[PDB]
């Protein structure tokens, strides 16, 4: 039942900015880490960043100055803002929540799952950047 | 590490205003066994489901146990307005809560029976004027300010109690009143389960 | 700095209804008791009711069935709905917060006061009922 | 009953990752005295004023003390983004909180000096899938999960540490890195204060 859905994908001309979404389903509250990753075809998955509810973020040091991560705790969506997008950035952008100390809970049902022993991976979205 | 519900199964249970709280952290519980030892007459929960508690893991489990008549099961919840909710026991209803009413079987010799059932009809505070009354309604997860002046078992219904508060406390008197309900053949008890979500979560799991 | 102000009083005809309000001035939050009282010239101050933030209410039996009390909390206002007023109910209506477990706190400033030994009374509002 | 700040003045203060916390309730305090014993360099508060702590009564006072270079004074708060805030120490900012930076006087012999200042550059969990980094950002009022694999004093800058997680935990590895700053002639320590408005029983309260 618990899943993450990415959005905002598509085509951007070079120099453009796109903000993507990773909405989560089946959890009222997440005390865990939500993170963004990019995989190019023929290339390994690379961490973009990790965010927690307080607003604390980690960037990969290559996404410095261009990539930003935000979270809406209500409306459980994590976001990635990518700026000065260039052709090389074309890749599949995926999102994950889990493996991170806190817990995922549904206050309506009473469900709880520990993120330390659990993780959810989003389906993916494609950003194609063209000249 | 199993959760120890042993303090409950040994001794005369406290009256509602003197509820005994067992906080369980880093333990595993089977509430089916505890309730199995008793004849449950109601298992009503708010913001949680009896069975979700048994199927999921929470940071802490709090069980508060007390001697309570089934005559007053309606009155125990905040749904019914009256003395128990106003001046004796209040749970954090918005938080996940369960209220259980059970009768102690003849087999359970270790849970002894009090001589009667007792509750505080009113806890009020007369002020320095000697006229003004500020009713002292119970806060949640806390005892009455009147537990000091109110007896553990009330001798007669309508008994009245008094304490003079020190000038530092704002002065005045603390006044209280008590009510008595007759004891049943088998002790009827009340249980309050409140569970808490947290960053760790895996502290009080089931099985 | 810290005060409670009563408004909503006036002249009403028998069988009339009035809504009175007591509003706090110097405190962001109250976990203390808030209460309504009535005093008549040459007469005793009498409790109408006391309310806590959760809504728990104790009502003097005399006013019970007619008067209803509520607390906004976000706006620190306690309300008295007097219904089926009679001329006998004519009196000064005063409000108090205090002499109860709890505290009055201004999140801004950092002011904190313990209500076991602290209270705020009110000047009052006059409700006269006539024929 | 005066609050006991004695544990702070005796012993080598711990590093930021292994910070030591004293939780005070039902005590009266003189923060002017504790800071009298030290040379204060900065005392910046967020949702409180230093004056209001000394002029008002609150439920709890939490003092977390650690050895911290004033070289990195900016990095301690979440206003500045970097390793200490992300993986070492986080206050429950938004709640009344104060951060103080101090240099231990020659007179304070009881507070001994560490061999070097040390901190966690990164604490991360590599997954079994080799999906790789899921960085373990610190939780407020809690310690980094890598304090187990990171030494109390890091031997060299760039030191890297590893633990293998159990199959039950999800497999994979916990990886961390260390960074070192040299020790000053007089120890520079950092103090974190979090005051809680609380409900009743405002108990910590000035002298």
UniProtKB/TrEMBL annotation, chains B, D:
Domain of life assignment: Viruses
Domain BetaCoV S1-CTD: 1-207
Sites carrying sugar chains: 30
Localization of this protein: Virion membrane; Host endoplasmic reticulum-Golgi intermediate compartment membrane; Host cell membrane
PTM comment text: The cytoplasmic Cys-rich domain is palmitoylated. Spike glycoprotein is digested within host endosomes.
Cysteine-cysteine disulfides: 3-27, 45-98, 57-205, 123-146
Function in brief: Spike protein S2': Acts as a viral fusion peptide which is unmasked following S2 cleavage occurring upon virus endocytosis. Spike protein S2: mediates fusion of the virion and cellular membranes by acting as a class I viral fusion protein. Under the current model, the protein has at least three conformational states: pre-fusion native state, pre-hairpin intermediate state, and post-fusion hairpin state. During viral and target cell membrane fusion, the coiled coil regions (heptad repeats) assume a trimer-of-hairpins structure, positioning the fusion peptide in close proximity to the C-terminal region of the ectodomain.
Domain notes per entry: Fusion peptide 1 (FP1) and fusion peptide 2 (FP2) function cooperatively and have a membrane-ordering effect on lipid headgroups and shallow hydrophobic regions of target bilayers. They are considered as two domains of an extended, bipartite FP. The membrane-ordering activity is calcium-dependent and also dependent on correct folding, which is maintained by an internal disulfide bond in FP2.
Family of this protein: Belongs to the betacoronaviruses spike protein family.
Quaternary organization: Homotrimer; each monomer consists of a S1 and a S2 subunit. The resulting peplomers protrude from the virus surface as spikes.
Protein name as catalogued: Spike glycoprotein
Higher taxonomy: Viruses, Riboviria, Orthornavirae, Pisuviricota, Pisoniviricetes
Section of the entire sequence shown: 381 to 587 of 1353
